[PDB]
Design an enzyme around this catalytic site. Sequence first.
Site, PDB file in Angstrom:
ATOM      1  N   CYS A   1       0.840  -1.208   0.000  1.00  0.00           N
ATOM      2  CA  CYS A   1       0.000   0.000   0.000  1.00  0.00           C
ATOM      3  C   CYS A   1       0.857   1.232   0.000  1.00  0.00           C
ATOM      4  CB  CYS A   1      -0.946  -0.040   1.182  1.00  0.00           C
ATOM      5  SG  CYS A   1      -2.003   1.422   1.459  1.00  0.00           S
TER       6      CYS A   1
ATOM      7  N   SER B   1       0.525   3.704   1.773  1.00  0.00           N
ATOM      8  CA  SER B   1       0.755   4.110   3.175  1.00  0.00           C
ATOM      9  C   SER B   1       2.026   3.452   3.724  1.00  0.00           C
ATOM     10  CB  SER B   1      -0.369   3.802   4.077  1.00  0.00           C
ATOM     11  OG  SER B   1      -1.572   4.445   3.688  1.00  0.00           O
TER      12      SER B   1
ATOM     13  N   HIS C   1       4.728   5.576   2.612  1.00  0.00           N
ATOM     14  CA  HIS C   1       4.796   6.836   3.382  1.00  0.00           C
ATOM     15  C   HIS C   1       5.735   6.683   4.604  1.00  0.00           C
ATOM     16  CE1 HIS C   1       1.880   8.603   0.840  1.00  0.00           C
ATOM     17  NE2 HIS C   1       0.773   8.398   1.575  1.00  0.00           N
TER      18      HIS C   1
ATOM     19  N   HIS D   1       0.519  -3.658   6.523  1.00  0.00           N
ATOM     20  CA  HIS D   1      -0.798  -3.630   7.188  1.00  0.00           C
ATOM     21  C   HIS D   1      -1.942  -4.221   6.368  1.00  0.00           C
ATOM     22  CE1 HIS D   1      -0.619  -0.012   4.651  1.00  0.00           C
ATOM     23  NE2 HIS D   1      -1.981   0.005   4.669  1.00  0.00           N
TER      24      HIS D   1
ATOM     25  N   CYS E   1      -6.926  -3.562   3.467  1.00  0.00           N
ATOM     26  CA  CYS E   1      -6.760  -2.111   3.372  1.00  0.00           C
ATOM     27  C   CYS E   1      -7.407  -1.584   2.093  1.00  0.00           C
ATOM     28  CB  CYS E   1      -5.319  -1.644   3.532  1.00  0.00           C
ATOM     29  SG  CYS E   1      -5.311   0.170   3.411  1.00  0.00           S
TER      30      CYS E   1
HETATM   31  N1  LIG Z   1      -7.878   6.579   4.515  1.00  0.00           N
HETATM   32  C1  LIG Z   1      -7.432   5.323   4.530  1.00  0.00           C
HETATM   33  O1  LIG Z   1      -7.832   4.493   5.343  1.00  0.00           O
HETATM   34  C2  LIG Z   1      -6.373   4.951   3.525  1.00  0.00           C
HETATM   35  C3  LIG Z   1      -6.238   3.604   3.152  1.00  0.00           C
HETATM   36  C4  LIG Z   1      -5.379   3.269   2.134  1.00  0.00           C
HETATM   37  C5  LIG Z   1      -4.647   4.274   1.553  1.00  0.00           C
HETATM   38  N2  LIG Z   1      -4.682   5.577   1.968  1.00  0.00           N
HETATM   39  C6  LIG Z   1      -3.997   6.621   1.310  1.00  0.00           C
HETATM   40  O2  LIG Z   1      -4.626   6.771   0.014  1.00  0.00           O
HETATM   41  C7  LIG Z   1      -3.678   7.266  -0.946  1.00  0.00           C
HETATM   42  C8  LIG Z   1      -3.697   6.394  -2.184  1.00  0.00           C
HETATM   43  O3  LIG Z   1      -3.150   5.138  -1.882  1.00  0.00           O
HETATM   44  P1  LIG Z   1      -2.844   4.125  -3.085  1.00  0.00           P
HETATM   45  O4  LIG Z   1      -4.029   4.025  -3.998  1.00  0.00           O
HETATM   46  O5  LIG Z   1      -2.253   2.877  -2.485  1.00  0.00           O
HETATM   47  O6  LIG Z   1      -1.675   4.944  -3.822  1.00  0.00           O
HETATM   48  P2  LIG Z   1      -1.085   4.939  -5.273  1.00  0.00           P
HETATM   49  O7  LIG Z   1      -1.249   3.590  -5.847  1.00  0.00           O
HETATM   50  O8  LIG Z   1       0.274   5.574  -5.172  1.00  0.00           O
HETATM   51  O9  LIG Z   1      -2.048   5.884  -6.103  1.00  0.00           O
HETATM   52  C9  LIG Z   1      -1.957   7.316  -6.082  1.00  0.00           C
HETATM   53  C10 LIG Z   1      -2.325   7.857  -7.440  1.00  0.00           C
HETATM   54  O10 LIG Z   1      -2.341   9.304  -7.374  1.00  0.00           O
HETATM   55  C11 LIG Z   1      -1.862   9.767  -8.612  1.00  0.00           C
HETATM   56  N3  LIG Z   1      -1.417  11.137  -8.411  1.00  0.00           N
HETATM   57  C12 LIG Z   1      -0.282  11.542  -7.846  1.00  0.00           C
HETATM   58  N4  LIG Z   1      -0.213  12.894  -7.829  1.00  0.00           N
HETATM   59  C13 LIG Z   1      -1.408  13.302  -8.431  1.00  0.00           C
HETATM   60  C14 LIG Z   1      -1.999  14.617  -8.780  1.00  0.00           C
HETATM   61  N5  LIG Z   1      -1.295  15.727  -8.471  1.00  0.00           N
HETATM   62  N6  LIG Z   1      -3.091  14.652  -9.347  1.00  0.00           N
HETATM   63  C15 LIG Z   1      -3.776  13.555  -9.625  1.00  0.00           C
HETATM   64  N7  LIG Z   1      -3.298  12.281  -9.426  1.00  0.00           N
HETATM   65  C16 LIG Z   1      -2.113  12.192  -8.790  1.00  0.00           C
HETATM   66  C17 LIG Z   1      -0.752   8.791  -8.987  1.00  0.00           C
HETATM   67  O11 LIG Z   1      -0.338   8.923 -10.340  1.00  0.00           O
HETATM   68  C18 LIG Z   1      -1.349   7.438  -8.543  1.00  0.00           C
HETATM   69  O12 LIG Z   1      -1.990   6.796  -9.638  1.00  0.00           O
HETATM   70  C19 LIG Z   1      -2.318   7.318  -0.182  1.00  0.00           C
HETATM   71  O13 LIG Z   1      -2.075   8.631   0.346  1.00  0.00           O
HETATM   72  C20 LIG Z   1      -2.524   6.343   0.958  1.00  0.00           C
HETATM   73  O14 LIG Z   1      -1.655   6.580   2.046  1.00  0.00           O
HETATM   74  C21 LIG Z   1      -5.556   5.892   2.938  1.00  0.00           C
HETATM   75  O1  LIG Z   2      -3.340   2.815   4.311  1.00  0.00           O
HETATM   76  C1  LIG Z   2      -3.914   2.872   5.586  1.00  0.00           C
HETATM   77  C2  LIG Z   2      -3.271   3.892   6.484  1.00  0.00           C
HETATM   78  C3  LIG Z   2      -3.921   5.072   6.816  1.00  0.00           C
HETATM   79  F1  LIG Z   2      -5.082   5.454   6.266  1.00  0.00           F
HETATM   80  C4  LIG Z   2      -3.329   6.019   7.605  1.00  0.00           C
HETATM   81  F2  LIG Z   2      -3.918   7.172   7.912  1.00  0.00           F
HETATM   82  C5  LIG Z   2      -2.153   5.669   8.172  1.00  0.00           C
HETATM   83  F3  LIG Z   2      -1.567   6.561   8.994  1.00  0.00           F
HETATM   84  C6  LIG Z   2      -1.525   4.513   7.917  1.00  0.00           C
HETATM   85  F4  LIG Z   2      -0.342   4.213   8.485  1.00  0.00           F
HETATM   86  C7  LIG Z   2      -2.083   3.636   7.064  1.00  0.00           C
HETATM   87  F5  LIG Z   2      -1.472   2.456   6.816  1.00  0.00           F
HETATM   88 ZN   LIG Z   3      -3.203   1.008   3.408  1.00  0.00          ZN
END
Ligand SMILES: NC(=O)c1ccc[n+]([C@@H]2O[C@H](COP(=O)([O-])OP(=O)([O-])OC[C@H]3O[C@@H](n4cnc5c(N)[nH+]cnc54)[C@H](O)[C@@H]3O)[C@@H](O)[C@H]2O)c1
Ligand SMILES: OCc1c(F)c(F)c(F)c(F)c1F
Ligand SMILES: [Zn+2]
Lengths: 374, 374
Positions: A46, A48, A51, A67, A174
């Site tokens: 993921c 995250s 990150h 995770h 996730c």
């Molecule tokens: N809230 C939650 O519980 C949760 C769960 C899982 C992931 N996340 C977050 O969700 C986000 C996405 O995760 P993911 O899908 O695994 O990531 P990912 O696979 O890196 O996807 C991100 C996408 O954003 C695109 N992107 C980057 N910059 C831009 C921009 N400026 N404009 C438009 N598109 C852009 C990029 O090209 C990629 O396709 C991350 O920040 C994770 O940390 C949060």
């Molecule tokens: O991708 C899920 C995910 C979250 F949404 C967070 F906000 C975070 F802090 C983290 F560590 C994480 F794994």
């Molecule tokens: Zn995640």
Amino acid sequence: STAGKVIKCKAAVLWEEKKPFSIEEVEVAPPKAHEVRIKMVATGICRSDDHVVSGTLVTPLPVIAGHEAAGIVESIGEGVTTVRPGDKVIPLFTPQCGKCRVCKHPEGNFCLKNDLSMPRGTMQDGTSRFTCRGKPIHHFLGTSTFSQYTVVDEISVAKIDAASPLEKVCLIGCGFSTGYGSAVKVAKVTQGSTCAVFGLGGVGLSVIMGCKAAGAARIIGVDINKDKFAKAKEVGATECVNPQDYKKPIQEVLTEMSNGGVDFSFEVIGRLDTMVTALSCCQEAYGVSVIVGVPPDSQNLSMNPMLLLSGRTWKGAIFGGFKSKDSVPKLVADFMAKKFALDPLITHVLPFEKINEGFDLLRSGESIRTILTF
Amino acid sequence: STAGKVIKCKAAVLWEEKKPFSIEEVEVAPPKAHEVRIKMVATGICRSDDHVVSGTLVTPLPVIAGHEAAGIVESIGEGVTTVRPGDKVIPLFTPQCGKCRVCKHPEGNFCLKNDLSMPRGTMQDGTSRFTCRGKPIHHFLGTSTFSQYTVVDEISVAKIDAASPLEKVCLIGCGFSTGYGSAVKVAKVTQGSTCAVFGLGGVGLSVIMGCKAAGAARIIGVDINKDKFAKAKEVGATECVNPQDYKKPIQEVLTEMSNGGVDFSFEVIGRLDTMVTALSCCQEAYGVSVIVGVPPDSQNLSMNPMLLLSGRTWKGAIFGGFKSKDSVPKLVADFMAKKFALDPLITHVLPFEKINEGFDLLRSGESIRTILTF
Ligand SMILES: NC(=O)c1ccc[n+]([C@@H]2O[C@H](COP(=O)([O-])OP(=O)([O-])OC[C@H]3O[C@@H](n4cnc5c(N)[nH+]cnc54)[C@H](O)[C@@H]3O)[C@@H](O)[C@H]2O)c1
Ligand SMILES: OCc1c(F)c(F)c(F)c(F)c1F
Ligand SMILES: [Zn+2]
Ligand SMILES: NC(=O)c1ccc[n+]([C@@H]2O[C@H](COP(=O)([O-])OP(=O)([O-])OC[C@H]3O[C@@H](n4cnc5c(N)[nH+]cnc54)[C@H](O)[C@@H]3O)[C@@H](O)[C@H]2O)c1
Ligand SMILES: OCc1c(F)c(F)c(F)c(F)c1F
Ligand SMILES: [Zn+2]
Ligand SMILES: [Zn+2]
Ligand SMILES: [Zn+2]
């Protein structure tokens, strides 16, 4: 036989930010009361987890991250009632204690026992079950799935269907659940609506799946990487737009495309600027925007509150709003019943030993989800 | 006797920011097609009118302000179907055209014909009905109620019960409806919940009324003017707090008092800092915060989006989320049936000619609502 004994196994240890994972032997303590030790079968990569590597997320190091996973219970501590040795399980990075004000609330899922807000990188009891080269290693979100074996608190594990394909259902830990729930539960996307999804990675694609499942008429995918568009259309996007192709800010483009603003928007990237763009592109009187992405630690966004005064709703959520231990087994059951697909999210399947290669695929833009197999 | 004729009458003209109103003669043109000329009977002093004076709210000057009012139709233009001469009416500062995408939406009320987002200070046709000293004078929100006569578009007026007491029900034209609706309609306050209300003026008292009507168990009033507390308790506050009494930020105080955050918070002041404080003080996983106060023109707030990612909902609304023309007559009928009280809001009564004294009362902190009689 391993029960009651320290396990020596392989794990991916992160010793410092911005370095590769080190694949090496760790020691895993047996589970204490109300704890579960799990043999990992599959874990997803993921953003995250990345990150933690990049310093976008601050968590105590050194750490075993990971995770999004699935495995099989190796042993249980005293007092465990909800899983047994041999059970298929998904670790829950958002726990469900069942006792806190959030767990008792009909619409809360961010259990107060979480290790997200103010991460300690420990078990519930404030200690670690991991050592490496004689040093204690931190946990991550109570899960730590980049290891052949982990120990989790009972409140951080769910039993799932014994016939589950763990190399697919790990995504319910996730990315699928987060995106799908963000649409169907958090936003509550309506039939016939117009949605905009910012970010077409694993989580954004799962948002699209949810918007399509909820009957949206239009689903506009937004990404700066046009290579992400074909798969977004396959899972339900009706249009895709690249902000880099426009002279106008994309909020203006999306407002024009939707004849005055979208019904529902989703930020699924993790940038402050796209969070404000996503809010702005929803219709000013009745639009809803959901923040899903994770932005850089301790940074504030700037916005004009007139965007909200007109009537917009702005919300965020962890794990799609799902109460984790109630929902994960139902989601796996629904997957087994063919209610949704996971294969569209899986681009790469690698052995665990290739974790670093899996992160490089994510960072290069190539992959959606890489599943690592133990 | 005046139908079709220019009316010379007194109005309160604002020629310049940060100056008293000038009570002087204006010329009021007859209504054009789909317009209504109203003889005003009563108008309230809302803090938003004072924002025009202070430059908090930017609208073209010179202007006839006023938006919280009630009167009697003097004449109707061609094609008007919804009111007749002699009808009691409330001007609607938020119109209800009934035809735009917002008017058609089940939860929208911020009709696209509004003059609030990008004020022109005109009638719908882009012209003014007011002259003073030979000069055209701006309208305000399509209402301009600080005049013995005004002209409004038909979509900006509602017919109300003929037996209405206009010196009371004028408050349904802004402050009561806004506060009450913000609680009952926008936040959807639940029975047994804990609410926090920032700002205990006429709008914030109306929010308290709505929270109490919805069954809240605890309603915490917040104001830096402790003189406001007695009336807040009369209408339903269970306890009041003055931020100036505490060493710690009030969001921390309210989180402690509510054992982890409130269910519902309301910003009813108009400050960027209390909008962020009010968000912060609602419970992080399931809390809801509603912005009611009008922020200062063109200024952005700064906030950490982690406040939303945990699960909070942030929203705002105009006029309590009420579809104005549908709702105002029903609210008057409910007042007539004693379903809510307006007298607690009315602290002072003055003749229209004493408008500047009425603004002085508001600015000093003494008044809640002053009602001006023509
Ligand atoms: N809230 C939650 O519980 C949760 C769960 C899982 C992931 N996340 C977050 O969700 C986000 C996405 O995760 P993911 O899908 O695994 O990531 P990912 O696979 O890196 O996807 C991100 C996408 O954003 C695109 N992107 C980057 N910059 C831009 C921009 N400026 N404009 C438009 N598109 C852009 C990029 O090209 C990629 O396709 C991350 O920040 C994770 O940390 C949060
Ligand atoms: O991708 C899920 C995910 C979250 F949404 C967070 F906000 C975070 F802090 C983290 F560590 C994480 F794994
Ligand atoms: Zn995640
Ligand atoms: N959204 C809408 O449709 C709508 C409608 C009506 C009014 N408004 C706005 O709502 C706000 C309140 O209007 P009103 O009730 O007529 O005003 P008011 O009577 O001036 O009440 C404001 C209250 O805020 C208190 N206050 C000032 N600063 C602070 C502080 N730092 N902390 C706590 N309390 C403080 C002040 O003492 C007063 O009692 C104004 O900004 C209006 O412009 C919005
Ligand atoms: O008090 C009601 C009210 C508002 F809520 C505004 F947002 C505004 F711009 C305005 F002029 C006004 F009168
Ligand atoms: Zn809990
Ligand atoms: Zn309309
Ligand atoms: Zn007002």
